[PDB]
Design a protein around this ligand. Structure first.
Ligand SMILES: *[C@@H]1O[C@H](CO)[C@@H](O[C@@H]2O[C@H](CO)[C@@H](O)[C@H](O)[C@H]2NC(C)=O)[C@H](O)[C@H]1NC(C)=O
Ligand SMILES: *[C@@H]1O[C@H](CO)[C@@H](O[C@@H]2O[C@H](CO)[C@@H](O)[C@H](O)[C@H]2NC(C)=O)[C@H](O)[C@H]1NC(C)=O
Ligand SMILES: *[C@@H]1O[C@H](CO)[C@@H](O[C@@H]2O[C@H](CO)[C@@H](O)[C@H](O)[C@H]2NC(C)=O)[C@H](O)[C@H]1NC(C)=O
Ligand SMILES: *[C@@H]1O[C@H](CO)[C@@H](O[C@@H]2O[C@H](CO)[C@@H](O)[C@H](O)[C@H]2NC(C)=O)[C@H](O)[C@H]1NC(C)=O
Ligand SMILES: *[C@@H]1O[C@H](CO)[C@@H](O[C@@H]2O[C@H](CO)[C@@H](O)[C@H](O)[C@H]2NC(C)=O)[C@H](O)[C@H]1NC(C)=O
Ligand SMILES: *[C@@H]1O[C@H](CO)[C@@H](O)[C@H](O)[C@H]1NC(C)=O
Ligand SMILES: *[C@@H]1O[C@H](CO)[C@@H](O)[C@H](O)[C@H]1NC(C)=O
Ligand SMILES: *[C@@H]1O[C@H](CO)[C@@H](O)[C@H](O)[C@H]1NC(C)=O
Ligand SMILES: *[C@@H]1O[C@H](CO)[C@@H](O)[C@H](O)[C@H]1NC(C)=O
Ligand SMILES: *[C@@H]1O[C@H](CO)[C@@H](O)[C@H](O)[C@H]1NC(C)=O
Ligand SMILES: [Zn+2]
Lengths: 7, 901
């Protein structure tokens, strides 16, 4: 699952 | 011990193929229970003789005729008689005791009939409820990740035990049934009741149970056929589709799939790609092979109300899941202890895939603020852990769940990106293709990837390494943390040591390597790339690459491709600073950010003075680009948190007002009086941050823009004149300047908001009022379900708390209403750890510590529950804040006074 991963 | 009391399955029996038929009942019974029924046949092969079948089963009731299963032989194999079947709940097994042994090489079929709750629990086959108009809708969907396939049907539910699956869904005839594979053909009526239909799906490839998916709903799709015939569909609520919200996802999917097929040198391994937007899907996204699930705000995009960061989030979350359709799904890591490789890889390549779809955006840069510096905050702690975990320490579902963390994802991504960079991408891609082709439809460990990368290294002569791929990566995967690399530019001496933010921390986790790494070190000297260097597993070395004349400067770790931070002697720092002051464009934008990120961390660790870090922000008055400003803002938010109620704040504010004004002025012109947005993403991001920084630091021109725009909105409510990008700042600042007219208008807008992301901005902006009475009235709303959603309650209180004026009010509110513990910890867990974290965040005095202790002195009944550990963290954190403020207040005050004119 998931990520992306914001900044 | 008995095998049914061990958490890992036996290796005596291996599955070949499954038939599974599921039937969700989307109408509750006369009691409000929703159920699904199922029937399954698993065909498996005996490897070693055994008189017991152990298969996973979780929360299923069996209604099979006779025992819980029927067992047959395949072809002309004989089968032993069943002695008994039992359920062993702890290890989540169905256990079939036989009266004789299964025979090596023989195949057997095991049939079962069963049912379970179609719960509101996001696990296995579950239900999801949402609203369409005044109508409450219920759909059935799946989340098998990690050990929940067994909650929907009995199966050998470990990722290496792959099989083909023939899925059939029985569903109301006016609903659509989706699964991993296309339907075999049109649905046919269920003979026992033609209000139901039967949809059969094509056989899956050999695959893992955790990647299965099946969905019954009223959803509709937008579609495209790629040139190779692959059908691409985006599924969502009918009203979302009709609104066009699925279009951006549809736009990027085709280009992302094409990028990956080429990148992986491997055809997309399925006939179709479905992606589905589910309301309130809290797992965020899951890479089910051929049927990827997303929460709506992750997949859907509304051009008229969504910001650019929103668009960035859609394209990268899509690239991430699609990455897995090869890496993870086609080739699967054999056990959960290697989860980091799978999620780390996707977390890295999501930027590559997304960059292909949006090539003007420079998306690849975002891994640095988004993953590298993010994870370095937690990996620079004594309480961190290595990427690697021995397989034999990961056994239970709870242990498996613990694999899914920041280290696995973000450090995984950082380390893999470092690896690709030091190998070069071409060479990395060659090993990657070789790995995928060798292990297609099978399972691997991380050592298999290293082996294939080493094969690529060994087949060429250009790239030379100081050791094997494995030996190098072992330094980054078998031990926790990362080094600070310190350079003395007068000698060219270079050292490494384990970097901890807390210089007084005791590291008790031992390393097989004594916390020494083998480190790839790129460098730039006077704006010119130098030869690449490897620091070997030594504490100190020397090289002339890092030796300068006092008019020269050197800067290590170009683009922060290496998973480390860099310190220099003070003279080199000043040279860098001078360069940044006179011609900044000579230093890559990512390194302009790095100088800030690293120096602030180094100051925390007492490796430079805090004034040196602050000195590194001085160039920002001439900085136009997003990242270096973001670095400053991320590093300074703690300063603001500690000092915004103190004498330090005016000078800080004035300093920031000074630094940001030219950037504000720049965008004023560039945007033609804020009428058109900058072209590319980085520049849009920079504008957002500039407006935010300007307004929140009291720049009159920003305050004026905010007031004007909001007044304009208020005179014409149906025509919002504020571009989505700027809404959060404009709304917040305007409400701050205004009174109940602005507040009541925004509240009205909140109450009729259709879109979650607009509602979020409004909720956050309403907390920006500078009227005590409005904030207290707002707090009084947060516990009313009619006005503020339950799921949004603590978020809202937290936003009020982050307002300096709202800080005492929110803190009083929490202490006083704490007895909403015997009300929200038995109906809906209610993120209490976040609330405590948020309202106590500012505490930095002995007096505030005493308040927190005095408040804690109510352990007598009530307790804290989910935030019991969060309170202890708040006390430790306050002591750390107290100490930091005492060490830093005087020095910081005078630096800001000195530099705000
Ligand atoms: C799922 O469906 C597939 C496809 O129809 C079945 O595959 C057949 O299985 C037997 C081997 O046991 C062969 O005789 C056929 O050649 C297979 N067909 C194809 C197209 O591969 C598979 O057996 C089914 N799974 C189960 C559990 O019945
Ligand atoms: C798994 O399901 C498949 C599909 O229903 C079964 O294969 C069918 O069996 C029926 C008889 O019940 C025949 O009419 C068809 O020839 C089969 N269809 C196909 C596409 O092959 C299969 O028998 C099931 N597996 C087991 C072990 O029962
Ligand atoms: C996987 O990679 C190989 C190697 O690059 C590709 O094969 C090459 O294709 C080009 C045609 O554009 C030829 O000029 C080369 O001579 C080919 N090399 C070899 C060794 O055959 C191949 O097309 C790629 N396959 C996939 C599925 O992406
Ligand atoms: C897990 O993966 C390994 C491969 O990494 C599988 O072992 C291979 O099986 C194939 C046939 O599918 C053989 O051609 C190879 O020689 C095997 N390699 C080995 C044993 O090292 C293994 O079958 C998979 N495990 C399970 C349970 O499926
Ligand atoms: C450091 O990162 C920058 C991106 O922030 C790289 O610059 C890009 O490089 C490629 C090819 O040279 C171009 O497509 C981009 O347009 C470049 N952007 C800019 C602003 O130059 C740079 O090449 C990286 N440096 C190293 C050594 O890898
Ligand atoms: C499973 O069985 C138990 C009683 O044995 C019952 O409480 C439960 O409701 C059953 N669940 C379903 C979904 O049939
Ligand atoms: C499907 O049928 C049910 C029962 O009549 C009804 O509640 C529902 O609105 C229908 N949905 C669609 C999409 O036609
Ligand atoms: C999808 O692509 C079309 C064609 O380029 C474009 O006009 C449209 O703006 C895109 N939709 C979104 C929401 O970006
Ligand atoms: C630099 O390294 C050499 C090599 O061991 C050592 O003798 C010298 O003292 C070091 N000097 C400084 C200033 O670090
Ligand atoms: C700054 O440096 C870059 C790269 O050397 C150069 O192209 C540019 O002309 C310089 N600008 C000024 C004002 O010195
Ligand atoms: Zn993932």
């Amino acid at each position: 699952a998931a990520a992306a991963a914001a900044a | 011990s008995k095998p049914w009391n061990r958490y890992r399955l036996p290796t005596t029996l291996l599955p070949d193929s499954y038939n599974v038929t599921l039937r969700p009942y989307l109408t509750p019974n006369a009691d409000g229970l929703y159920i699904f029924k199922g029937k399954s046949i698993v065909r498996f092969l005996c490897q070693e003789p055994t008189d017991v079948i152990i298969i996973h089963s979780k929360k299923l009731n069996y209604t099979t005729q006779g025992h819980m299963v029927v067992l047959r032989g395949v072809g002309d194999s004989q089968v032993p008689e069943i002695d008994r079947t039992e359920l062993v709940e702890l290890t989540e097994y169905l256990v079939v005791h036989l009266k004789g042994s299964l025979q090596p090489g023989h195949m057997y079929e095991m049939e079962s009939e069963f049912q379970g709750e179609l719960a509101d629990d996001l696990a296995g086959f579950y239900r999801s409820e949402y609203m369409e108009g005044n109508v409450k809708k219920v759909l059935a969907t799946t989340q098998m990740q990690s050990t929940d396939a067994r909650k929907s049907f009995p199966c050998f539910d470990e990722p290496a035990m792959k099989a083909t699956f023939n899925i059939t869904l029985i569903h109301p005839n006016n609903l659509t049934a989706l699964s991993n594979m296309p339907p075999k053909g049109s649905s046919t009526p269920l003979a026992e009741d033609p209000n139901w239909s039967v949809t059969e799906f094509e056989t899956t490839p050999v695959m893992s149970t955790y990647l299965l998916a099946y969905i019954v709903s009223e959803f509709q799709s937008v579609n495209e056929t790629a040139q190779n015939g692959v059908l691409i569909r985006i599924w969502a609520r009918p009203n979302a589709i009709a609104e066009g919200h699925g279009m951006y996802a549809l736009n990027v999917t085709g280009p992302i799939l094409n990028f990956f097929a080429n990148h992986y040198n491997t055809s997309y391994p399925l006939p179709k790609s479905d992606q589905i937007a589910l309301p309130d899907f809290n797992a965020g996204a899951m890479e089910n092979w051929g049927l990827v699930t997303y929460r709506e705000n992750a997949l859907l995009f509304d051009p008229q109300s969504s910001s650019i960061s929103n668009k960035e989030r859609v394209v990268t979350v899509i690239a991430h899941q699609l990455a897995h359709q090869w890496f993870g799904n086609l080739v699967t890591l054999a056990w959960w202890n290697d989860l980091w490789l799978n999620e780390g890889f996707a977390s890295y390549v999501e930027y590559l895939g997304a960059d292909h779809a949006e090539p003007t955006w420079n998306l690849k840069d975002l891994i640095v603020p988004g993953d590298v510096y993010r994870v370095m905050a937690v990996d620079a702690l004594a309480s961190s852990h290595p990427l690697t975990t021995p397989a034999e320490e990961v056994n239970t579902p709870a242990q498996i769940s613990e694999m899914f963390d920041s280290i696995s994802y973000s450090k995984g991504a950082s380390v893999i990106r470092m690896l690709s960079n030091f190998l070069t991408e071409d060479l990395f891609k060659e090993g990657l293709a070789s790995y995928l082709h060798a292990f297609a439809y099978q399972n691997t460990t991380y050592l298999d990837l290293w082996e294939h990368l080493q094969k690529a290294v060994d087949a060429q002569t250009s790239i030379r390494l100081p050791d094997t791929v494995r030996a190098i990566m072992d330094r980054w995967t078998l031990q926790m943390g990362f080094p600070v690399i310190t350079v003395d530019t007068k000698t060219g001496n270079i050292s490494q040591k384990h970097f901890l933010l807390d210089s007084e921390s005791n590291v008790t986790r031992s390393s097989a390597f004594d916390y020494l790494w083998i480190v790839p070190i790129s460098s730039i000297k006077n704006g010119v790339m130098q030869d690449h260097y490897w620091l070997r597993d030594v504490s100190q070395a020397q090289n002339d690459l890092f030796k300068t004349a006092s008019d020269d400067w050197v800067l290590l770790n170009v683009n922060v491709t290496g998973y480390f931070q860099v310190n220099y002697d003070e003279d080199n720092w000043r040279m860098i600073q001078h360069q940044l002051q006179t011609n900044l464009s000579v230093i890559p934008v990512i390194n302009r950010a790095q100088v800030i990120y690293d120096s602030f961390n180094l100051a925390t660790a007492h490796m430079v003075p805090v004034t040196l870090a602050l000195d590194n922000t001085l160039f920002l008055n001439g900085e136009k680009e997003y990242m270096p400003w973001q670095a400053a803002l991320s590093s300074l938010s703690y300063f603001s948190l500690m000092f915004d109620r103190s004498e330090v704040y005016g000078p800080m504010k004035k300093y920031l007002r000074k630094q940001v004004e030219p950037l504000f002025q720049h965008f004023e012109t560039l945007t033609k009086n804020w009428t058109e947005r900058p072209e590319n993403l980085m520049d849009q991001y920079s504008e957002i941050n500039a407006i935010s920084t300007a307004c929140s630091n009291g720049l009159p021109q920003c305050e004026n823009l905010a007031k004007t725009l909001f007044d304009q909105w208020m005179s014409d409510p149906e025509n919002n004149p504020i571009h989505p990008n700027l809404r959060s700042t404009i709304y917040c600042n305007a409400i701050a300047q205004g009174g109940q007219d602005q507040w009541d208008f925004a509240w009205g807008q909140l109450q009729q908001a259709q879109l979650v992301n607009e509602a979020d901005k409004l909720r956050s902006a309403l907390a920006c009022s500078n009227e005590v009475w409005l904030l207290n009235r707002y707090l009084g709303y947060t516990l009313n379900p009619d006005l503020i959603r339950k799921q949004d309650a603590t978020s809202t209180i937290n936003s009020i708390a982050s307002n300096v004026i709202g800080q005492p009010l929110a803190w009083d509110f929490v202490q006083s209403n704490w007895k909403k513990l015997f009300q929200d910890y038995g109906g809906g867990s209610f993120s209490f750890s976040n609330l405590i974290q948020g309202v106590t965040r500012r505490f930095s005095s002995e007096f505030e510590l005493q308040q927190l202790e005095q408040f804690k002195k109510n352990n007598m009944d009530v307790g804290f529950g989910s935030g019991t550990r969060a309170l202890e963290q708040a006390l430790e954190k306050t002591k750390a804040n107290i100490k930091w403020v005492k060490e830093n207040k005087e020095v910081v005050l005078n630096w800001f006074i000195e530099h705000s004119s």
